Ligand binder design. Structure first.
Ligand SMILES: [Fe+3]
Ligand SMILES: [Fe+3]
Lengths: 203, 203
């Protein structure tokens, strides 16, 4: 929404997000990077976008050369809020309903994970790797790569899982090792949040 | 230089960093991990087809070719990093009179140029590069140019003179989220003798 604010996380960022993220990695990501997106969004939006949800702001400003700055900050605020709800200490096991949807689409959970890591590894520069529901294709699950502030809402996709591949997301704990970050992140994924987003996306 | 690519010899020992701004680890990751991976991937995608060609040739032959975007990315990044690593040296090198004069005539002063270059770097969204180029199509005037991802000014017909990497990996080890501090401090390590040589040759 607007005036936007840094959301409360499901866990204490001061303890990191064990076993994959250190307190420093979480501190920089949330209190520096996400907070800057929130502040800049509030500054570029002012009072103009009041009452609108962040999704509505994103859709109103997407592909508008005069409001690219606002698109970048609004989309990054949505993207980080989504990503920070996708992680939790020690993760949460995948509920049956989501495991079933992932298995039917990708052949297995391990085939999905391998396909998602490949997409993340090959997402050139700053970006995001997503698992979305495609309402224009029988609510099927699709892996989607976005560049910079790119947001799948602009494509009509319904996000269910977001993984940040901007270097700041992993540089403190993994340095140049984006493949290791992608392989290890599975240990902290809150699959109960993903299943909730999946269940809501299919109506 | 040419294909098959190799990591360029640096003017300094990366094991000592690049004092007073870069630690040995920041240099180690940037050159031996990031730059090396661009070299290896370029050599893999170029194969035998681009053997014996210069890096500039590969960048231009493959630019604006959707089927060879992978090759463009690796070839442009190898050029960009080779240029950047030649722009830095421990304690820097003072600006020669000929370049100081060209910078002063264009930007009003050296200080005004630096402030303008920092603003461009700070506002270069996502992964990118901030350049000082000579524009041969405009009376050899100096211009500040921002490129995104692997973006290379050679494709615009610009003649690079200074490259500053703004991909987060260029500064994350020593400056974390503080891209403005990295940009303000980098001036202390710039090899202005190399820049003046590039300027003089660019005409
Ligand atoms: Fe991020
Ligand atoms: Fe770099």
């Amino acid at each position: 929404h607007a005036p936007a604010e840094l959301p409360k996380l499901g866990f204490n960022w001061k303890d990191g997000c064990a076993p994959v993220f250190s307190p420093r990695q979480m501190e920089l990501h949330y209190t520096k990077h996400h907070k800057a997106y929130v502040d800049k969004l509030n500054a570029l939006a002012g009072t103009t976008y009041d009452g609108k949800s962040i999704e509505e702001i994103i859709l109103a400003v997407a592909n508008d050369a005069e409001k690219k700055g606002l698109f970048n900050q609004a989309a990054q605020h949505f993207n980080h809020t989504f990503y920070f709800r996708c992680i939790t200490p020690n993760g949460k096991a995948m509920p049956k309903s989501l495991e079933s949807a992932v298995t039917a689409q990708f052949g297995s959970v391990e085939q999905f994970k391998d396909a998602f890591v490949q997409a993340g590894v090959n997402n050139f520069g700053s970006g995001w790797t997503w698992l979305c529901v495609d309402p224009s294709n029988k609510n099927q699950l699709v892996i989607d790569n976005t560049s910079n502030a790119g947001c799948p809402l602009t494509k009509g996709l319904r996000p269910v899982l977001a993984v940040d591949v901007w270097e700041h997301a992993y540089y403190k704990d993994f340095e140049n090792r984006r493949p290791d970050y992608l392989k290890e992140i599975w240990s902290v994924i809150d699959w109960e949040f993903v299943a909730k987003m999946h269940a809501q996306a299919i109506k």
